[PDB]
Design a protein around this ligand. Structure first.
Ligand SMILES: O=P(O)(O)OC[C@H]1O[C@H](O)[C@H](O)[C@@H](O)[C@@H]1O
Ligand SMILES: O=P(O)(O)OC[C@H]1O[C@H](O)[C@H](O)[C@@H](O)[C@@H]1O
Ligand SMILES: O=P(O)(O)OC[C@H]1O[C@H](O)[C@H](O)[C@@H](O)[C@@H]1O
Ligand SMILES: O=P(O)(O)OC[C@H]1O[C@H](O)[C@H](O)[C@@H](O)[C@@H]1O
Ligand SMILES: [Cl-]
Ligand SMILES: [Cl-]
Ligand SMILES: [Cl-]
Ligand SMILES: [Cl-]
Lengths: 331, 340, 340, 331
């Protein structure tokens, strides 16, 4: 029913999303349960800093979750791209926890970093889609993102799944706080919804195809805060997928312009950023939540730290359709 | 005797830079004296981590030094964007040390963060040029890069001085390590060489002029390693000053316009090489900033080459950046635009 | 209606104790409110370690709670002697939290340490009874056990209140843990039972009197576990008040005099048992402080038995200690000595 | 030439002392080199706290060195008696380093703690006299105190050796500081001397025997600060060895009275403590350094943190001679 293995597994995303969660997340009393680390959480809760080492899309899932990780656990969280992390030979110690987010679980510069980390005493955690990958083997432990065999060039379904995992992670770390308890369920009750919210984004597919007639070599993702990671990812996409040139940037430190203005990332600074383009007159594309010279794509409103999950879909849909329109093997 | 103020203060650098070190560093016996911190140092030494909070160019000085703070001190160092950091509401604590870096001292978002960090118990440090700045009042302690009064519309000299500052900051903290004195005296000496070395790069002004006639709409700077800050820096200079578009990218990550490329020996990796290959293979001419006497392109291919002195790796950025100011200035002149 | 002030304030305890908790703890919904710390708490939570600095009896309240602070908070807790700590010049830092415990607030060595810790950047907390005390001024924050004005020559009520204090201190810090609410509500409830339970022990005054006629020159108190603070406490009471000699020892470590022995169920280990055996085997009579209804000695052997209510383990010490005050008082009376 | 295996190896102490040091300590440029941890120091220098778990004499070596350890490394150092440490079930984590000082390397409550520690994630370090003892086996690493087979009931030679090891340890941790560099050599140059300084204490042996005619069931060790550990050890001795009753206590928080008044531990508080007994009139025994109703035993003056090493010898000598005079198997 879909002409590309990239396209099916963009739509796979309602399921891939829930598979990520099934069993591990308990929605009625709110207990997330990652047996993958039942053995090491104790240690992590009490650890110096958590360092995120990842690549391509996996790097963007780290950005996208950093924010909520940190709030949820109060720990120095930081996100390092493995290629770089190596060049810089960051010092790392025994108190440190090193979380590696992989789809493949085979990425070279990751594995290198993993080794470096390992031989340097740090504790290691894999966040891997793949079964019995290298990473899987060498890590002290780590979650299996439990998505479904990814088979398109692009890390489409993988992304959102990782994102969810990463969250479930942050929750399970932080599961012994009465003060967070409120915000714990919120997110969880909201996670339950995420999968069907995914389907309702996949209806804009029609309006998105539509939008692919006025576009021409370029595109800018205009994000801030939570929806920053989404901007950069959307950017990675267009490039990686459509062999056009996108560049995600942070709203207004300052011509087809995607600008996320979902409520979770609606700053005056994003505001004036758009207001500033509307006066220039080039039609920007405004992603945001139902009921708010341009065009605007709706996305149902979720708990802000899950908001990134939805907003990225239109991004995949566009990028896919930008490569259909150019007759390119998307697989 | 220059046509713009901003052009002036670029050549102010082999001087602003000297004064930034002047009397704060001893070259005979290789120690570094930063008065302001004098009563907070051993404190900063024993601390959990360092968050550097900054804006525009100040963010980049922090990036360029980030690698080296870590190296010297082994304190975890995070570089943060003033505006952004705030939006996140990152949890901050007593054990924390928050270096605030400003040329001005009055940047709005920088301040709310200084207040924020202050509100939450953290130790606050202020690295500024400006005198009386809101910052330097409310910061627990701090330093004045002390480079002069900047009259150009963006941070040229300030960047480099800030840089220098941050580095002496990084040296101060690591002064009690015997297995470092080697690379300490490595760094401090090469520091002393900096200003004159700036001068050989300023001579490179002519070549840079002529380049601007073969460059227009958007520019790719390319960097990895130490020179990955300078990439986003030139990207910013170009972006702000010359009112073109630019973007620095991490090299070897993944039609026919300019390509600045940094192949100084601190930042030469295979991926920086491949980076070039495919560009020289798409038969397009890059501009290769790199050390005097370097066959970076099998020379049969067309490409300019800007030529820079070779210094201590973590210092190189201070040089690599000048040609990119010089570039970002003349383009703005050529484009008619008043660089003040 | 008592013959000495000190005797008075012992029976003041089921009251001084109530006031120490009074309005600072909610029994319906099991949370604990300590005003003073209110703006320093989440800070104390995220901190490296806790050094408790104290003298005489105040040192012992800190010991008795040390086990339980750790348990509740998982912050590393070190108990230190004011005088000694100073002599060592222990290195202290910003991340540090230094609980100073005083009944008086003006103990000389306690102060120099508060200054010392202050001089060196550490967070300083003041747990005192006294109002206006030098301490409570200069401490960053702190609490008043708020137990009353102590007119006896040594710390009876104060100890127990201090204790209580420290515990509520320990509860406050661990209030945000869901896997603790169980033992929290365990502790807070048993706290509410404390004062009356004091009363059953004060009834034990008669028995204690008669004991003093079968006891003289030097006394061995014996303890391990929770009750190892109470050991050195009675050792001190006896030492100071009754002007005998005493010494508490950790039980089961390795001619014919008195032996106090604590066999309450918090502090019952094999080594506490063997401890007894060999003493009951040397055919000498111990005095076994322990819970009502306990065959601690196969009863055929001669030995008194003081009888104490059974409470939450970390609280037990508050009870076990009274009989030892009662002892240390009457001996001093009998010995003629003016206990004020 | 000595009538007891306890007595020989009290005198063995010049040699046992230097054997502890040979090769590992380099006296001319001042490098202490413990290959036993060449593999873990990196980690220890950077670790949360160091916890000392020991027994009998081994506990007292920890006290005796705590002081200089802490000054030399600035780390939370703490000394826990294993029996207790267990009862209290102290929480302990991955950042933590746990140093176990054993002569035997077989002590039960130690081994237990070691296990506890281990199964709780902490890093473990043995400080063991014995070759291939249990401790030896289970530790991440640890020094071999390299004394000589101890064969008397008492931990005589063992003590001082441990003490030295413990120091060499603290040094090697702290070996990368320019500010300490001064105080580093001082101690080292002073360590060189320690062994012969030992011999000159062993001449008081004559005067000590002598002193064992006025003594009678008791004895108090009166120490403060550095010489506190020595007081408690001297106390352990008399009891353990002579089946008399000693009780080491800290100077003056207030009748044959040993009071250490070596220069390293000469406080006004020790002062008034003695001055206070001289007025009572009972002849106290004053240990101190050559040239300063009582009796007084000389002990050459060493670098204060090594001072404890000497002062303990007269203590052994007395305790030995208190058990010769009572016709007790000292072996
Ligand atoms: O997602 P992996 O398997 O860890 O690899 C990371 C990245 O590796 C490369 O950068 C690819 O271009 C991406 O598809 C991918 O995001
Ligand atoms: O923090 P400072 O000293 O005011 O300067 C840093 C930046 O401040 C602002 O954010 C400017 O827009 C930037 O162009 C500038 O580089
Ligand atoms: O610290 P505080 O409140 O003055 O009281 C503790 C001790 O202070 C002094 O050191 C007294 O000599 C002790 O007997 C007393 O117990
Ligand atoms: O010194 P070890 O072998 O670790 O055992 C510790 C102690 O064990 C017991 O307590 C002995 O009585 C002592 O001889 C010894 O000091
Ligand atoms: Cl899992
Ligand atoms: Cl300065
Ligand atoms: Cl209060
Ligand atoms: Cl060794």
């Amino acid at each position: 029913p879909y002409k590309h293995f990239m396209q099916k597994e963009i739509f796979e995303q309602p399921d891939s999303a829930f598979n990520t969660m099934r069993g591990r997340i308990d929605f009625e009393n709110c207990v997330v349960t990652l047996g993958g680390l039942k053995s090491w959480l104790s240690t992590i809760r009490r650890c110096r800093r958590i360092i995120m080492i990842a690549c391509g899309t996996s790097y963007h899932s780290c950005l996208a979750t950093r924010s909520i990780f940190e709030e949820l656990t109060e720990i120095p969280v930081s996100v390092e791209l493995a290629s770089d992390f190596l060049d810089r030979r960051s010092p790392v110690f025994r108190d440190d926890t090193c979380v590696f987010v992989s789809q493949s679980g085979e990425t070279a510069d990751s594995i290198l970093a993993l080794q470096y980390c390992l031989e340097r005493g740090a504790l290691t955690v894999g966040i891997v889609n793949s079964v019995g990958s290298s990473m899987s083997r060498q890590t002290h432990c780590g979650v299996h993102i439990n998505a479904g065999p990814e088979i398109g060039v692009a890390s489409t379904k993988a992304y959102t799944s990782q994102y969810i995992a990463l969250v479930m992670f942050a929750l399970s770390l932080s599961n012994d706080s009465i003060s967070r308890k409120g915000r714990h369920e919120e997110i969880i009750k909201g996670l339950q919804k995420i999968p069907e919210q995914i389907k309702q984004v996949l209806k804009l597919e029609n309006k998105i195809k539509d939008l692919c007639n006025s576009s021409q070599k370029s595109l800018l993702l205009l994000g801030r805060g939570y929806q920053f990671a989404t901007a950069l990812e959307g950017a990675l996409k267009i490039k990686e997928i459509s062999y056009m040139h996108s560049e995600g940037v942070l709203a207004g430190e300052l011509l087809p312009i995607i600008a996320f203005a979902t409520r979770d990332s609606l700053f005056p600074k994003v505001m004036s950023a758009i207001e500033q383009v509307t006066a220039r007159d080039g039609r920007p594309i405004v992603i945001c939540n139902e009921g708010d010279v341009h065009t605007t794509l709706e996305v149902p409103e979720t708990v802000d730290c899950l908001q990134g999950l939805l907003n990225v879909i239109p991004l995949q849909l566009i990028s896919y359709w930008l490569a259909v329109n150019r007759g390119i093997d998307v697989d």
